[PDB]
Amino acid sequence: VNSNIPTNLRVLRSILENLRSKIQKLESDVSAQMEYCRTPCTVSCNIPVVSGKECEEIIRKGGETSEMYLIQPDSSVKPYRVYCDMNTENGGWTVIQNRQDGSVDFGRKWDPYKQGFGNVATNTDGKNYCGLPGEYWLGNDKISQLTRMGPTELLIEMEDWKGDKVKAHYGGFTVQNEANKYQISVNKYRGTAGNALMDGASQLMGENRTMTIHNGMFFSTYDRDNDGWLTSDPRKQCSKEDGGGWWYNRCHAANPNGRYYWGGQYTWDMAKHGTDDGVVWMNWKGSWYSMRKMSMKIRPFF
C-alpha cells in the first residue's frame, strides 16, 4: 500500500506541466515587447517662454500652471528641463523624483543616478506642451547643487492604491557633492507619513530602528557600496537587494526608487532577493506595500 501514494504524487507532473506552459507565455511576452521596442516613445515638449533659477522664481514670474519648465539656477550651468508643481501647497516646487506608473526602471548604476534618468514630462494630448510629469530622478549633481544655493525645504508626498495621500515635510534639506558621496541631511519634520528619514521605521524597537535611519547616510547604487551594512559578501548590499539608488543604511525605513509593485500589496516570495524592495514608506503602510504614487519636490524656503 506504499503504491497508492507515489501514484498520488502525480500532482508533480500536473504542476511541472503548468510551469512549462507558463515559461511558454513568458517567452512570447518577452519577444512581443522586444518587437514593440524596435520603435521608441516620443514627446514634443515645446518649451515655455518664462524661466528662472528654479520653480519658486517661475511661479513668482507668472508661471502659474504645473508643467515642464527650463531652469538655470546659475549663470554657469546649462539650463536644464524640469517639472514644476505650481499647485501643491502654494506651488513653486521643483520636482526631484517621481513615481506614478511603472514606466521607468529605477535600478541603475552610480552614473545614471548622477546624471539623471527617466522622463521629465509628456504631452497632455491635444496640448503642445508637457503638462504631465513622467517618472524620473533628476541627477544627483543637479540635486546637490540645487540644495546648496541656500536654505532648501523638501516635500515628500505619496498615495496608496485606494486614494489616501500623506505628506512628509522636511524644512531643511541639503545634499553634498559626489566627493562626499552625495551625503543627505534633513531636519524640521512635519507631515503625516512618519519621519522615517530621521527616526527610522516607527514599528521596530531597539537597534533595529536606528539602523533604518537615512539622515546622514551616504548614497549607494547596486554598483557602488556606501550603505551602513558592513560585510565582505558582495551579495549583501542594501542596493543590490531592495533594488534602488538611495541613502541606504542597513537598510531602510523608506525606499522610494524601489520596485513598482502593481496593486500595492506584495510579499517576500515575490521579491527578487526576498527583501522589501518596492516603493515603501514603513511608518505609514508597512513593509509589504508598494505605493501607487510617491514623489520628492523642493523649494528655496526663502
Binding site: 514593440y36 521608441p40 516613445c41 511603472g102
Partner: protein
Amino acid sequence: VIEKVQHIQLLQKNVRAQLVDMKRLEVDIDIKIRSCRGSCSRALAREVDLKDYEDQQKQLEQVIAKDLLP
C-alpha cells in the same frame, strides 16, 4: 523498496523550489515590461496569475506531508 521515496522527496523539494523561482520570475518580468512603457512605443498589456501560483504552492506544500512508514 523504500529506495523510491527519496527520489520523490528530492523531486518534492526540487519542484516547490522551481515553483518559487518561477513566481519571482513571473513578477520580475511584469515589472520589467512595464518599465518599457516610458522607453518604447508601447508596453505589452499583461496579467499575472498570482492566484494559480499560490493555488499550486498550497497544493504541493500539501503532498509534502507524505509518509515513509516510520
